[PDB]
Amino acid sequence: SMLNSELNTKIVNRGKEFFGSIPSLFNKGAWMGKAMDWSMQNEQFKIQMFRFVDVFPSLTTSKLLTEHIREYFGNEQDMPAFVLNKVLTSNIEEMARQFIVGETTKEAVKNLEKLRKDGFAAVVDVLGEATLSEEEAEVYTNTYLELLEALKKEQGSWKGLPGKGGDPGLDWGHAPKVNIAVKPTALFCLANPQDFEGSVVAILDRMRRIFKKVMELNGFLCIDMESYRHKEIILEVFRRLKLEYRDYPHLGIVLQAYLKDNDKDLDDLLAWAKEHKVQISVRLVKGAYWDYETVKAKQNDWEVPVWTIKAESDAAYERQARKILENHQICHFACASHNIRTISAVMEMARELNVPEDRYEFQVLYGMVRKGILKVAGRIRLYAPYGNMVPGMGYLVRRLLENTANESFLRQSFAEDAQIERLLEDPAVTVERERAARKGLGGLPPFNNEAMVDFTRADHRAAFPKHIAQVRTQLGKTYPLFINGKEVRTNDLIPTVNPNKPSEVLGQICQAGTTEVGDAIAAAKAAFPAWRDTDPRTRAEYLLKAAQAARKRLFELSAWQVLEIGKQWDQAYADVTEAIDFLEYYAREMIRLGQPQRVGHAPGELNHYFYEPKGVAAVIAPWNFPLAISMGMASAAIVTGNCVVFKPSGITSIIGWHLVELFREAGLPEGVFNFTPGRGSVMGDYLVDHPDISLIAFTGSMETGLRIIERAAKVHPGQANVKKIISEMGGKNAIIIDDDADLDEAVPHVLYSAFGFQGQKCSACSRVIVLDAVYDKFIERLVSMAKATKVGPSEDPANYMGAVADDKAMKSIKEYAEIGKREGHVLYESPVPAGEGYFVPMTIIGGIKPEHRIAQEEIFGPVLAVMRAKDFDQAIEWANSTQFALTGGIFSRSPEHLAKARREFRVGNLYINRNNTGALVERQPFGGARMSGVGTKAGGPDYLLHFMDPRVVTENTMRRGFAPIEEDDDWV
């Protein structure tokens, strides 16, 4: 504290030596500076300009360029002041080139030597589009090998940068002259902590190949740190490679000070190095993915992994830099910051702790007043990317964002002309100041979606194998009907087996005959009057209890689905959380809708409008979302005051039994929920036709749904109501890939949309409609990514997709595949495992047109039709050419085309620039019309009303010429 004030005074003074000894982006004479100036003045313009730079390299024709310019910036008149094609192209390309050292290896190597003669060391990084295949990972890997080979032939002629002593052939007498950095996920297109070991090994195998070449020339390899999703994978890759070459000192890892985890990660890493008696090198950065991590975490209800006050990152940096410097004997340090306070702190801290100069250096990005830094510090290394202008454009966008952020130390230092005292402030003080400077109903928290499984966590990774094993000790049970609170066995048993291993029998399911169905309907009807008269808030409370019951069994409930229906780990967990979401959301919806509301405002009169349940609801559930959709339909019916007779799909009957367990744990009154699995040919029509049924909730095939709708319309003798239908049926969903689509995003999202859970989703992409000029490029990357994926048992997280639901689904899907192969041409058909299991290959077929059967009929399996549209008008026309309208997707960065799709691509759920599956409660209420449904949307604010009928009570309040005056009366 007393000492703290003294050192801070030394840091501040050093800060001014840098300011005394002291960019293009803030120079308002150049076109770039004027564009950034207006960007920092106008946020609307900033958004347009940055998005334009992002899409710019896809603007490959005069038409694409001209139209996008108009669409982002308006006409040549309403634009800002600062031939539109020529002025923008040359400038943007000029801005991009300022940050790269070359587009070829020979140019980069030539430029690197010029840098050396100016006294700058370098670390070289290879620019590239995201790796989406093995071939792309190999190209990336070979580029480093090629670079290293070039440098190998040159470095012998390089004099070492001048130092105070040591080896005049080494930089500053100690640093290796060749220094490269590699992006780990660029070495493996399927890097994913869900398959942690597989990812580590695949990345590590390529990294080792590069490292060996690096060691051959006694160079340095730094392993870059990417997004939080891959942080643990990356640390483990570094740890393994280090120990494989425990004696080689020139291996480095990046750590990010903006991570709450980093204090611990750095402590652990230092302890690990000590334990193994190795040395390490750390490049400490603040972090490149701030906005992305914040958004990502908030989208999945995860804890935000980054500090959210900017000074907290600065304070963390100075704190973690001190820790490394304290540990200089084992940990070499690279300070990687452009912040003069941060740099000045590191310099005085190294002085305070008497750290030798060969234990720390300073690094900055090429293109971002370097000389002034080099004069005070002396040991400066430029981060020097080289490669293609396409990824160079995306890199530029990053630099523009970085330099023009409100919290950017650079923007504050120039563009704002800030007080130097505030700039060189101890960020710990800033932190405390910033911290100092800083709705549900009925007493319940507001709704929030349940947190998604998070495989960055060791415990979540370990949980699945544990619970799959625990579920396996519980196999072989016989499951009874559940009627009026009693278990009811019958003599008709149907086995439920593992679709990935059909010899594994999970249990036996009793089947309800018509007598048993009639009993359950009778039970539901008898329970109805009391349940109807139960207060809506009380009914909602059972759903809340069921939700907690489920939340407590999350991994166990997931594991059942992995085995019974072949859900992948993530897919299984998402099914359970969606069930939880329905329970939480429908509970709140009933509370909201449960209070009678006064309508009209005439005095002497009270009108109250409110809702009543219908009676007995038949709920006929699908197997593809066996807990989520079952629970959603059933809980909606129940919470609105109806009583339910529930028929799970046969092959997911055990998941259906989970509803019994959950409502039982919640203490739901007897007969409000009854469980009657049964054979459709025996009791399907009976259930639908029955006169005591007032409502039918169905999700499944169009054919079955349409039949139900037809039969339910009949009013039989003794039937009290016209039957209400709540039906969600299938889709034939298209994703459109526009000319300007970002293919790094489009390809994996399309792959997931088509083959996630074997394509067994009503929302699945079964048609990808690709614009003529981007067709060949798109399919090549899509097929190459597909080839990298593996088909097999869903319990093994290394597999992308596995077996389809059952034998019948397999035969039907395979027939469709053959039909499609006669209509189009096969682009990819995966291997499948030998032996048992209902495996259908991951299948992609091109040459498909709207007249083809597989362009029209829902296959409900891993068969993707690729269709080539001649222009955007045809793409939309083709998207709209089926009898379905459930979901749709479009990858496009054209405001005009997006506007057209929003208007004309009329599906129930249209997605823009992301996959078209995985709808979430409240955020994406799900459902459509045409042959896809009856316009009901589960998980939305209109849904509960479908399960009820409105009532009005009107009271004349006037007696003997007087009436009470009510609040909202129109009076005098």
Ligand X SMILES: *[C]/[C]=[C]/N1=C2[C]=C([C])C([C])=[C]C2=N([C][C]([O])[C]([O])[C]([O])[C]OP([O])(=O)OP([O])(=O)O[C][C]2O[C](N3[C]=NC4=C3N=[C]N=C4[N])[C]([O])[C]2[O])C2=C1C(=O)[N]C(=O)[N]2
Q: Which residues are catalytic?
A: 728, 762
- 307 annotated as a binding-site residue: no
Q: Is 663 annotated as a binding residue?
A: no
Element (H, E) at 640: none
Site for its own copies in 940-969 (CB under 8 A): 940-942, 945, 948-956, 958-964
In the complex, the smallest distance separating the C-beta of residue 314 from ligand X, rounded to whole angstroms, is: 6
Residues contacting residue 121 through CB under 8 Å, at least 6 positions apart: 161, 171, 175, 177, 179, 361, 379, 380, 381, 382
Which stretches of 824-871 are DSSP H helices? Answer: none
Secondary structure element (H or E) that encloses residue 256, with its range: strand 251-256
Distance in Å, CB of 602 to its own copies, minimum: 5
Instruction: Tell me the C-alpha distance between 778 and 517, whole Å.
Output: 52
State which of residues 383, 752, 838, 926 lies at the interface with ligand X (CB under 6 A). 383
- Spatial distance between the Cα atoms of 394 and 384, rounded to a whole number of angstroms: 15
Q: Which helix (H) or strand (E) holds 520?
A: helix 514-532
Choose from its own copies, ligand X, none: what does 727 bind? Cβ within 5-8 Å by kind. Answer: its own copies
Continuous segment of H or E residues that includes residue 724: strand 724-728
Residue 302 assigned to a binding site: no
- 121 near ligand X, judged by CB under 6 A: no
| Closest separation in Å from C-beta 881 to its own copies | 12
Q: Which two tokens stand for residue 256?
A: 């990010």
Tell me the two tokens of residue 449: 């979606």
| Opening angle at CA 560, ends 558 and 564, nearest 5 | 125
Evaluate the CA torsion angle 817, 792, 192, 221 in order and state its sign.
negative
Kindly tell me which of 283 and 539 has the beta carbon lying closer to ligand X: 283
Distances (CA, A) of 808 to 653, 805, 812, 813, 859: 17, 8, 6, 9, 12
User: Annotation-wise, does 432 bind a ligand?
Assistant: no
Residue 937 in the binding site for its own copies (CB under 8 A) = yes
**Residue 883 phi, psi dihedral angles, 5° rounding:** -90, 5
| 308 is known to lie in a ligand binding site | yes
Query: Interface with its own copies by CB under 8 A: which range of 19-27, 139-147, 216-224, 393-401?
Result: 393-401
What is each CA distance from 934 to 17, 763, 885, 897, in whole angstroms? 72, 16, 11, 28
CA dist., res. 74 & res. 114, Å (int): 43
User: Scanning residues 870 to 929, which ones bind its own copies (CB under 8 A)?
Assistant: 883, 893, 898, 902-903, 906-914, 920, 922-929
In the complex, minimum distance from the CB of residue 421 to ligand X, in angstroms, rounded to a whole number? 17
Q: Which of 199, 262, 313, 496 binds ligand X (CB under 6 A)?
A: 313
Rounded to 5°, the CA angle 294-298-303 comes to 80
Q: Closest approach of Cβ 453 to its own copies, in Å? A: 17
322 marked as binding residue: no
Closest CA to 793 of 778, 784, 804: 804
- H/E segment holding residue 343: helix 340-352
623 near ligand X (CB under 6 A): no
Residue type, 2: M
Is residue 359 close enough to count as binding ligand X by CB under 6 A?
A: no
Q: In the bound complex, what is the minimum distance in angstroms from residue 468's beta carbon to ligand X?
A: 35
If one asks whether residue 331 binds ligand X (CB under 6 A), the answer comes out as no
Residue 930 contacts its own copies per CB under 8 A: yes
By CB under 8 A, what part of segment 180-219 binds its own copies? none
Asked whether residue 256 is marked as a ligand-binding residue, the answer is yes
Q: How far is 120 from 100, CA to CA, in rounded Å? A: 15
Pick from 23, 378, 485, 603: which binds its own copies (CB under 8 A)? Answer: 603
For residue 288, give both structure tokens: 């490149």
Other Cβ atoms within 10 Å of 75 Cβ, number: 9
b/e per residue 579-595 (b: at least 16 CB within 10 A): bbbbbbbbbbbbbebbe
Sole binder of ligand X in the list 141, 342, 642, 766 (CB under 6 A): 342
Query: Which of residues 288, 826, 929, 963 is near ligand X by CB under 6 A?
Result: 288
Q: How far apart are CA 626 and CA 656, in angstroms?
A: 7
* Contact string 19-58 vs its own copies (x = CB under 8 A): ------------------------x---x--xx--x----
Q: Is 935 in the site for its own copies (CB under 8 A)?
A: yes
Q: Is residue 226 a contact partner of residue 131, using CB atoms and an 8 Å limit?
A: no
Find which of its own copies, ligand X, none residue 455 binds, CB within 5 to 8 Å per kind. Answer: none
User: Which residues are bridge partners to 501 per DSSP?
Assistant: 498
Q: Which of 363, 496, 640, 727 binds its own copies (CB under 8 A)?
A: 727
- On whether the CB atoms of residues 272 and 303 are closer than 8 A, the answer is no
- Contact criterion met (CB below 8 Å) for 512 and 563: no
What's the farthest any 2 CA atoms get from each other in the chain?
112
Using CB under 6 A, pick the residue from 198, 219, 287, 641 that binds ligand X. 287
Choose one: 93-101, 759-767, 809-817, 934-942; the region binding its own copies (CB under 8 A). 934-942
957 annotated ligand-binding residue:
no
Q: Is 286 in the site for ligand X (CB under 6 A)?
A: yes
CA distance 560 to 338: 52
The answer to whether the annotation marks 276 as part of a ligand binding site is no
Q: Which is nearer to ligand X, 69 or 234 (CB)?
A: 234
Q: Which of residues 783-822 bind its own copies (CB under 8 A)?
A: none
Does 158 engage in binding with its own copies (CB under 8 A)? Answer: no
What is the DSSP annotation of 857-896? S---SSEEEEEEESSHHHHHHHHT-SS--SEEEEE---HH
Q: Does 224 sit near ligand X (CB under 6 A)?
A: yes
972 binds its own copies (CB under 8 A): yes
Given candidates 534, 607, 789, 856, which one binds its own copies under the rule CB under 8 A? 607
Interface with its own copies (CB under 8 A), residue from 84, 170, 215, 304: 304
Considering the complex, state which of residue 727 and residue 794 has its C-beta at the smaller distance from its own copies. Answer: 727
CB atoms under 10 Å from CB of 602, counted, come to: 9
Q: Does 712 bind its own copies (CB under 8 A)?
A: yes
Using CB under 6 A as the binding rule, whether residue 129 contacts ligand X is answered as no
Given candidates 256, 676, 830, 932, which one binds ligand X under the rule CB under 6 A? 256
One-letter amino acid for residue 478 of the chain: T
Whether 325 contacts 356, CB under 8 Å: no
Q: Which does 408 bind (CB under 5 to 8 A by kind): its own copies, ligand X, none?
A: ligand X
- Known binder of ligand: residue 402? yes
Size of the site for ligand X (CB under 6 A): 34
How far, in Å, CA of 531 to CA of 609, rounded? 20
Q: Of 265-273, 362-370, 772-780, 887-895, which part binds ligand X (CB under 6 A)? A: 362-370
User: What's the rounded Cα separation, in Å, for the pair 415 and 122?
Assistant: 28
Please pick, from the candidates 71, 136, 265, 312, the single residue that binds ligand X as defined by CB under 6 A: 312
Contact residues for ligand X (CB under 6 A)?
Answer: 125, 183, 224-225, 254, 256, 258, 285-290, 306-310, 312-313, 336-339, 342, 363-365, 383, 402, 407-410
Indicate the annotated binding residues for (S)-lactate.
183, 398-399
Indicate the annotated binding residues.
183, 225, 256, 283, 286-288, 290, 308, 310, 337-339, 398-399, 402, 409
